[PDB]
Amino acid sequence: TLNGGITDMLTELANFEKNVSQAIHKYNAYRKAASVIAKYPHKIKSGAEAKKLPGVGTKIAEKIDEFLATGKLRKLEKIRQDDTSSSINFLTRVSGIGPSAARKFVDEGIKTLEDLRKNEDKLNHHQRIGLKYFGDFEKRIPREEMLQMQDIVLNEVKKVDSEYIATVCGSFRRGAESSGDMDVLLTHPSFTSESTKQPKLLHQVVEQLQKVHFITDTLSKGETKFMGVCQLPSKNDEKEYPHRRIDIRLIPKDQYYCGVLYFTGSDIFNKNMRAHALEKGFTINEYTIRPLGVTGVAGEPLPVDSEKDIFDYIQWKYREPKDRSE
DNA sequence: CCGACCGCGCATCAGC
DNA sequence: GCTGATGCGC
DNA sequence: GTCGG
Ligand SMILES: Nc1nc2c(ncn2[C@H]2C[C@H](O)[C@@H](COP(=O)(O)OP(=O)(O)[C@@H](F)P(=O)(O)O)O2)c(=O)[nH]1
Ligand SMILES: [Cl-]
Ligand SMILES: [Cl-]
Numbered sequence: 261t262l263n264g265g266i267t268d269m270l271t272e273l274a275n276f277e278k279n280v281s282q283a284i285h286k287y288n289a290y291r292k293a294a295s296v297i298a299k300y301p302h303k304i305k306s307g308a309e310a311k312k313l314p315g316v317g318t319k320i321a322e323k324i325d326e327f328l329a330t331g332k333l334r335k336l337e338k339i340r341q342d343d344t345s346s347s348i349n350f351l352t353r354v355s356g357i358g359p360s361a362a363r364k365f366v367d368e369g370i371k372t373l374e375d376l377r378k379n380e381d382k383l384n385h386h387q388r389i390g391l392k393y394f395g396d397f398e399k400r401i402p403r404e405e406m407l408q409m410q411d412i413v414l415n416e417v418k419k420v421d422s423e424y425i426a427t428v429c430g431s432f433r434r435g436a437e438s439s440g441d442m443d444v445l446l447t448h449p450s451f452t453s454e455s456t457k458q459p460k461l462l463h464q465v466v467e468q469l470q471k472v473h474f475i476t477d478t479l480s481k482g483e484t485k486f487m488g489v490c491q492l493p494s495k496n497d498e499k500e501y502p503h504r505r506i507d508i509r510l511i512p513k514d515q516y517y518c519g520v521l522y523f524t525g526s527d528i529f530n531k532n533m534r535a536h537a538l539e540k541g542f543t544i545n546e547y548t549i550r551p552l553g554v555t556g557v558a559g560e561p562l563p564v565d566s567e568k569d570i571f572d573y574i575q576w577k578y579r580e581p582k583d584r585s586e
Numbered sequence: 587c588c589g590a591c592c593g594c595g596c597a598t599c600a601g602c
Numbered sequence: 603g604c605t606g607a608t609g610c611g612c
Numbered sequence: 613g614t615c616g617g
C-alpha cells in the first residue's frame with residue numbers, strides 16, 4: 261500500500277491490455293512493473309526514481325509522473341468512459357469468460373450480468389458456474405476459514421487412503437491472512453514419474469469430498485487436475501458461507517518439491533524464477549528442473565531433494581514461501 | 587535495433 | 603474417433 | 613512495454 265496508487269494504476273492498465281487489447285506481453289509488462297514497485301520500500305516521488313527499477317521503462321515512468329502530479333491517468337479515464345472496453349473488462353470477471361469470449365458476447369449485445377443470466381443457454385459449463393457464483397468468487401477467504409477448509413480436506417483425504425498427502429499451497433502456504441481460493445497439492449505413493457499403479461487416484465478424492473458435500477460443483481476435471489467449487493458447512497440458523505474456488509493438482513510423488521514450488525507461487529514469482537532459470541541454462545516446470553544443452557533442448561531431470569535444491573541450481577539464495585509473494 | 591517474454595492441464599473446436 | 607490449435611485458467 | 617546483447 262506504500263505506492264498503492266501507482267500499483268493500482270498499473271494493474272488496471274495490465275487488465276486493459278489483457279482483456280481488451282489481447283496484448284498478453286503488454287499485460288505482463290505492466291504486472292511486472294506493478295510487482296517491482298509494490299516491493300519497493302520507499303514512497304515513490306517521481307517517474308525518474310521509478311525508472312531505476314527493472315521493468316519500469318520510459319512509458320511507465322511518464323505515466324507515473326502524470327499520476328503523481330494529478331492523482332490520475334487520462335488514458336485510463338478514457339478507457340473507463342469507453343462502453344465497449346468497460347463491458348469487455350466486466351465480462352472477463354466471470355470465471356470461464358476470457359478476452360475472446362467476452363468480446364464475442366459484447367458483439368452479440370450481451371454486456372451485463374442481467375444479459376448473461378438471460379442467456380445461460382449461450383454459456384459453456386465452466387462459464388455457467390462462474391456466473392452462478394459470480395458474487396461469491398469475488399470474495400476473499402479469511403485465513404481462519406482456510407484453516408477449517410484445510411482441516412476438512414486433509415481429514416477426508418486421510419479417510420480415503422491414509423497414504424495420500426494433501427498440502428495446501430497458494431497464498432495460504434505463503435502465510436497470507438486471506439486467499440482468493442484454495443489450492444491443494446495431492447500425492448500418493450502409487451503415482452510416480454515411473455508408473456501409475458492405481459487409477460482414479462484423483463477421482464476418489466474428489467468423490468469423497470462431494471460425498472460429504474464439501475465440493476459442490478465441478479469446473480473441469482482430468483486425471484491429475486481438478487478445478488471446481490466448495491463450501492464450508494454452516495451451523496443451525498446461521499447464514500451459509502460463500503462458495504469458494506478449489507483447485508486440486510495430483511503430482512507424481514517423486515516430483516513433490518517441483519510441484520510444491522510451482523503451486524506455492526506466486527504466479528509472478530514463478531515467471532521470474534523460471535526466466536532466471538533460462539538465463540542460468542535450466543528449464544523449470546511443475547515436475548522437474550532440467551538443463552538446456554547447447555542446442556537449447558531440455559536434458560534429463562536433475563536430482564531434487566528439497567525446494568532449496570531448485571534454488572541452488574539456478575544460483576538463487578533460498579526464499580521462504582512467505583517471501584515469494586510477488 | 588529486435589527477439590524473447592514460463593510452462594502446462596482440461597475443454598472445445600476444426601479438419602481429417 | 604484422432605491430433606493439433608486455441609481459449610482459459612492455475 | 614521493457615530489456616539485453
Ligand atoms: N508457472 C506458473 N504458475 C502459475 C501461474 N498462475 C498460477 N500459478 C501457480 C502459482 C500460484 O500461487 C498457484 C495457484 O494459483 P492462484 O491463482 O490460486 O494463485 P495464488 O498465489 O493462490 C493467489 F493468487 P490467491 O489464490 O490467493 O488469490 O498456481 C502461471 O501463470 N504460471
Ligand atoms: Cl503484446
Ligand atoms: Cl486513474
Ligand SMILES: [Cl-]
Nearest residue numbers: 515516517518
Ligand atoms: Cl521434485
Ligand SMILES: [Cl-]
Nearest residue numbers: 545547548561
Ligand atoms: Cl518434465
Ligand SMILES: [Cl-]
Nearest residue numbers: 435580581582
Ligand atoms: Cl514461509
Ligand SMILES: [Mg+2]
Nearest residue numbers: 430441442443
Ligand atoms: Mg490460490
Ligand code: NA
Nearest residue numbers: 311312313316
Ligand atoms: Na528501469
Ligand code: NA
Nearest residue numbers: 352354356357
Ligand atoms: Na474470466
Ligand code: NA
Nearest residue numbers: 441442443507
Ligand atoms: Na487456484
